[PDB]
């Protein structure tokens, strides 16, 4: 069972979220939780919540048995970006994109 979970329009870049994702790709779920737990990045907490939501999905909706359960596929696509304005000076406008990301965790067992 593939059984996936995800977080859409998360406030982080993707470039940032990846790096945390990349630590987890392919591990036994058990390890990932520990890994994330001692990884001092906001994207860690994000990815965790998703991973956790995924397990609970796999658990309550499909087979379950988390013990034999690995994060087989994880990626983050870049979401829509919120345009803002600030100004650096002389009136001379700066776009600044508050970039967002679509975190996605697929936690199966084969």
């Amino acid at each position: 069972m593939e059984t996936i979970a995800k977080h859409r329009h998360a406030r982080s870049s993707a470039q940032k979220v990846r790096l945390v994702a990349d630590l987890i790709r392919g591990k036994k779920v058990s390890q990932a939780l520990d890994i994330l737990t001692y990884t001092n990045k906001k994207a860690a907490v994000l990815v965790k919540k998703v991973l956790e939501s995924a397990i609970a999905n796999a658990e309550h909706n499909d087979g379950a048995d988390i013990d034999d359960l690995k994060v087989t596929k994880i990626f983050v696509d870049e979401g829509p970006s919120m345009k803002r304005i600030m100004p650096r000076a002389k009136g001379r406008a700066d776009r600044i994109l508050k970039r967002t990301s679509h975190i996605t965790v697929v936690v199966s067992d084969r």
């Binding site: 919120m82 345009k83 803002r84 304005i85 002389k90 001379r92």
Partner: peptide, 20 residues
């Protein structure tokens, strides 16, 4: 967005006279 005001100056300004 709301986000839409550009009053781009004049070049910017300082220097240049580049020998005549």
């Amino acid at each position: 967005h709301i986000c839409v005001t550009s009053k781009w100056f004049n070049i910017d300004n300082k220097i240049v006279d580049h020998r005549p």
